[PDB]
Amino acid sequence: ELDPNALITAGALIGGGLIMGGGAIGAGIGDGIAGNALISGIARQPEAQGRLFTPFFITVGLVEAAYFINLAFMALFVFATPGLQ
Amino acid sequence: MELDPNALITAGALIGGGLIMGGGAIGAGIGDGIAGNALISGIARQPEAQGRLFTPFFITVGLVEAAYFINLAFMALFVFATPGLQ
Amino acid sequence: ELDPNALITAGALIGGGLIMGGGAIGAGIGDGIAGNALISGIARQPEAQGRLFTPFFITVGLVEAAYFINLAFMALFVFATPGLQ
Amino acid sequence: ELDPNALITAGALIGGGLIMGGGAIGAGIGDGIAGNALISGIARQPEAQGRLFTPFFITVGLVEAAYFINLAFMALFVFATPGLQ
Amino acid sequence: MELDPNALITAGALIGGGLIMGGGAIGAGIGDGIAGNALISGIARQPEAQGRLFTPFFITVGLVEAAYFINLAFMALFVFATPGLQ
Amino acid sequence: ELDPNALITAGALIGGGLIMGGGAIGAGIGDGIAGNALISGIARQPEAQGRLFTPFFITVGLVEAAYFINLAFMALFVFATPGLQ
Amino acid sequence: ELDPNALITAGALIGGGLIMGGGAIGAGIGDGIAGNALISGIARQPEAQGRLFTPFFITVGLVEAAYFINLAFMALFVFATPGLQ
Amino acid sequence: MELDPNALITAGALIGGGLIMGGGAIGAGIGDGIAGNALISGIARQPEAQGRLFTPFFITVGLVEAAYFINLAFMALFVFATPGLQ
Amino acid sequence: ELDPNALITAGALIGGGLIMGGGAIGAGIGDGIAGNALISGIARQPEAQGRLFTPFFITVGLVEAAYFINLAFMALFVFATPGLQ
Ligand SMILES: CCCCCCCCO[C@@H]1O[C@H](CO)[C@@H](O)[C@H](O)[C@H]1O
Ligand SMILES: CCCCCCCCO[C@@H]1O[C@H](CO)[C@@H](O)[C@H](O)[C@H]1O
Ligand SMILES: CCCCCCCCO[C@@H]1O[C@H](CO)[C@@H](O)[C@H](O)[C@H]1O
Numbered sequence A, C, D, F, G, I: 001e002l003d004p005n006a007l008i009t010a011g012a013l014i015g016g017g018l019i020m021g022g023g024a025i026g027a028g029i030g031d032g033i034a035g036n037a038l039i040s041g042i043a044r045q046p047e048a049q050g051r052l053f054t055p056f057f058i059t060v061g062l063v064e065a066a067y068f069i070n071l072a073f074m075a076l077f078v079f080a081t082p083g084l085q
Numbered sequence B, E, H: 001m002e003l004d005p006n007a008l009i010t011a012g013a014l015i016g017g018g019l020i021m022g023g024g025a026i027g028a029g030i031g032d033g034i035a036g037n038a039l040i041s042g043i044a045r046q047p048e049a050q051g052r053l054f055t056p057f058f059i060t061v062g063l064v065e066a067a068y069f070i071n072l073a074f075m076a077l078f079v080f081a082t083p084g085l086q
């Protein structure tokens, strides 16, 4: 006993998992790489501490936009599954 | 037990759409973090730069985001207008 | 012999595993990259220790947010599976 | 109830998604890494802007060639599926 | 031909547990190698550091290993106490 | 209704997608990393601009060889599928 | 003709493959990155050759611990499969 | 509906061969790009080197390519002589 | 029509492919990263060639150990499949 939505919903959960698994790879590594520059810049140029946070937050904003746009589509896949029967 | 052809096709479409956007976010998050790493370091080294660094930064981010959003458009095709649906 | 929730739960477990596998890739590598800058920065200048831990912990907080938001959605997938019949 | 093209088209969509997911990982990260050198190079020496955009655009052209050759084969897989019955 | 519901659920649990630990080791191996890269370089540059480098090194490795072992705990949940088993 | 080649062909398209998805990850990131050195070298040593292109094209040639050998095997998988029935 | 353990065992081999495939990605890249620092440190500071091996082996030990703990769980999955019927 | 055992085995072989070569090209493309990055930078810094840099470059590329071609040989085994075919 | 070993062998081949795909990612990238330090080190100081090959070959030995231990378990999976019926 199966029904079509069992297979569609399984596909939706696997697809949603790929969306969020990739989002976290991009966000964790992209934010780490941005922070690496912030930390090194402050070590090299202490007086710049305050001004380095502006390009840092621009960068984190871009990185997090990918994470949260992915999250929104994961939510679509698993709560409003396109093609559900 | 009941399946139909579109149950399998739609499951494949969702998995494929998920691969498209999972890979898009890996490329966008890491590419934008690497571009921003250089912006931050460049401003730390040459604070007077700033102005001349944001043009190359925006060109780089534009290229990275183009991959993200072209992928997003094809994810949308896969899941809202699946090619090969029966 | 199968039933619809057997296939849905299998998809939920694979999807939850993708979510946490990607979370740990982003957290382990992003935290390592942040820490690389902290360690290098302190090596270059021992008196900067305090001032470097602040951007380090901001970076780690961002990286860990990805990890734990993913963990929450893994828990949703496997304990309150969206689409279970 | 299934037919052979249902399984073939499912495989084509998964395969097309792998092609484009890998294309974007290579394009986003390769373009980011190229741009990192462009930005750093201009920071070090503002008068080098023109001369650095030339190798940058050569690099981006190579990276984008991978992306768009992959995109063409994704289109082959999902619109003119090889092996469709 | 005989399957039962738990055959499918347990196969999904094992694949999911494998993803959890495969990703955990990718993050732990590369994160710990990157942390150690800085420890090694820092000692090459400032051999008298040593002492002051091991505290940031251990904090970094502790964070990386926390991801590895939290993942391991959920792999164990997935395969020894599978949620949703019938 | 299925037939054996439906499953074989689905496998071939997924395998071909893995081959090209991995090829583009390797090519986009490898070419970006090669170009990063080209751009930085020209920034550091402008007079070397012309001579840096020789090791650059050797490197890109190696990277692209992996991409195109993969492409050839993807073509084999999906147009001349080994094991087709 | 299938039986439940055929599907469980297939899942166990795929899960074991993911465990060891991820372990080798982490170990090969983590050890390479550790060795990069060892080689560069010796190039920069020849007299330090002997003392750099201590932090190097600490680092490799951590990296290999992930590899071999993964190996042990792969062995569990494929030789003492949890949930086997 | 008709399947036979080799349809499933051959589908697994093709997916497995694809993983082998997808991973081979990831390792070869990025490893060769990283090796070449050092060759290019080394020649930028020490143009008179050149000669002494190509031996370590070729040893490194030889190691990277060995992984690529050993993988290729096993992909060929998987898909042209599948172990376990019935 | 199927039999249990058809599904087990399919899982073994996918699992063996994961093992070798991950082995080559770790070996190619880890060896490239080691070699990057060797090449840079010799560029900086040609007389250090001999002394840099020693840590290079230690690093490569570690990286290759991951590759070949994985290769051995791939061979176990596909030639002496654990759980074959
Ligand atoms: C939706 C796309 C948003 C991209 C980020 C843009 C944020 C604003 O970027 C601005 O650009 C200026 C150049 O005129 C810089 O000098 C400023 O520091 C910066 O705030
Ligand atoms: C969630 C994980 C956080 C771990 C925090 C461990 C405590 C680190 O604490 C740090 O110790 C330094 C001395 O080494 C001080 O100079 C810093 O100000 C302090 O933040
Ligand atoms: C879950 C996200 C955790 C990270 C949020 C951290 C926000 C920190 O905010 C920052 O604090 C700095 C302290 O010096 C200031 O210099 C900056 O101006 C300020 O933006």
Ligand SMILES: CCCCCCCCO[C@@H]1O[C@H](CO)[C@@H](O)[C@H](O)[C@H]1O
Pocket (backbone or CB within 6 Å): B055, B056, B059, D049, D050, D053
């Ligand atoms: C396909 C994406 C290409 C984007 C190109 C954007 C235009 C960049 O144009 C660049 O502007 C520089 C000044 O900032 C000039 O010095 C360079 O010569 C010029 O190429």
Ligand SMILES: CCCCCCCCO[C@@H]1O[C@H](CO)[C@@H](O)[C@H](O)[C@H]1O
Pocket (backbone or CB within 6 Å): D054, D058, D059, D061, D062, D065, F049, F050, F053
């Ligand atoms: C799709 C591939 C796009 C990249 C192809 C770029 C080929 C550029 O070719 C290069 O042009 C340089 C310009 O200074 C010259 O210095 C080099 O000698 C020449 O090889």
Ligand SMILES: CCCCCCCCO[C@@H]1O[C@H](CO)[C@@H](O)[C@H](O)[C@H]1O
Pocket (backbone or CB within 6 Å): E050, E051, E054, G054, G058
């Ligand atoms: C199980 C966790 C093991 C983590 C590695 C710890 C190995 C011992 O680490 C020791 O720490 C000292 C600080 O007191 C350093 O000065 C020594 O060089 C080091 O041997």
Ligand SMILES: CCCCCCCCO[C@@H]1O[C@H](CO)[C@@H](O)[C@H](O)[C@H]1O
Pocket (backbone or CB within 6 Å): F054, F058, H050, H051, H054
């Ligand atoms: C099939 C394997 C091809 C590997 C690339 C080799 C390309 C030729 O490499 C040559 O090696 C010389 C050393 O004698 C270098 O000095 C030259 O710059 C280079 O052209």
Ligand SMILES: CCCCCCCCO[C@@H]1O[C@H](CO)[C@@H](O)[C@H](O)[C@H]1O
Pocket (backbone or CB within 6 Å): H055, H056, H059, I049, I050, I053
């Ligand atoms: C398993 C792959 C190992 C390849 C080893 C190739 C031989 C490299 O041999 C190296 O040659 C150098 C000169 O270039 C010598 O200075 C080194 O001492 C020597 O180890």
Ligand SMILES: CCCCCCCCO[C@@H]1O[C@H](CO)[C@@H](O)[C@H](O)[C@H]1O
Pocket (backbone or CB within 6 Å): G049, G050, G053, I054, I058, I059, I061, I062, I065
């Ligand atoms: C399969 C694993 C291969 C790598 C094992 C290499 C062990 C080398 O051992 C090292 O040899 C060095 C030579 O200078 C010494 O300086 C170190 O003290 C010693 O620990």
